[PDB]
């Protein structure tokens, strides 16, 4: 039909969408993990909120630093997809699955993915580029 352009569903807005916009509006939810006598206890509460938020951003960024992508928010890695993790067609995943239920399915298996991608591929891409730079 006729159109005018995209819209703005806002912060956490595509939490019920079935991939699509939720797999496109990655930039609207990653931009506010930083948020851009009575004062001897309240200020300690406010600073403990802000510094913990800075920790919350930085320790999630360090895991993306380990998995060498550097083109953030979307990056590809060459680990093959085991069928034991999830037995679904990609048309079932990317048309008929919200992100929250997908994480609810995967979340028992996520630490194995994290350990395998940290241990195997970054130790098999580095110490091979030094071998490629022999001559």
């Amino acid at each position, epitope marked *: *039909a006729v159109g*005018i*352009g*995209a*819209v*703005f569903l*806002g912060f956490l*807005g595509a939490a019920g969408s079935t991939m699509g916009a939720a797999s496109m509006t990655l930039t609207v939810q990653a931009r506010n993990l930083l948020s851009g006598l009575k004062l001897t206890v309240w200020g300690i509460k406010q600073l403990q909120a802000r510094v913990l938020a800075v920790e919350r951003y930085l320790r999630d960024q360090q895991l993306l630093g380990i998995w060498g992508c550097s083109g953030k928010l979307i990056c590809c890695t060459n680990v093959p997809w085991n069928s034991s993790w999830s037995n679904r067609n990609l048309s079932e995943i990317w048309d008929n699955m919200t992100w929250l239920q997908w994480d609810k399915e995967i979340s028992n298996y996520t630490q194995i993915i994290y350990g395998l991608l940290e241990e195997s591929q970054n130790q098999q891409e580095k110490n091979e580029q030094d071998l490629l730079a022999l001559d």
Partner: nanobody
Amino acid sequence: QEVLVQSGAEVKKPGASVKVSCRAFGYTFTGNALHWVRQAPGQGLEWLGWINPHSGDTTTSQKFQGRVYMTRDKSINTAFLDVTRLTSDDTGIYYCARDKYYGNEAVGMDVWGQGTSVT
């Protein structure tokens, strides 16, 4: 829980301009485009145009270019319609409507306001 509330009924002189408001409750205002449709009493609907509330772009039919203007306000979640150079043809009930907006296009007008009578 999602409604559109409009302003009261107005009577105006020919050649003047009329402004009618439409406030959105119960849905995110910057997420769905808004249609404006009128109905003179005695027959069916007539269509003016529709507006993106986020980017600010408008679209107006060719019968009413330069006469019908559409604005919006994000701070109070409202849409304003200005009709200028009035005749006796435009007397009727005006409607703002929420587009369904699936797949970055127009799909259907789901939630409509109660209507504003302009004479």
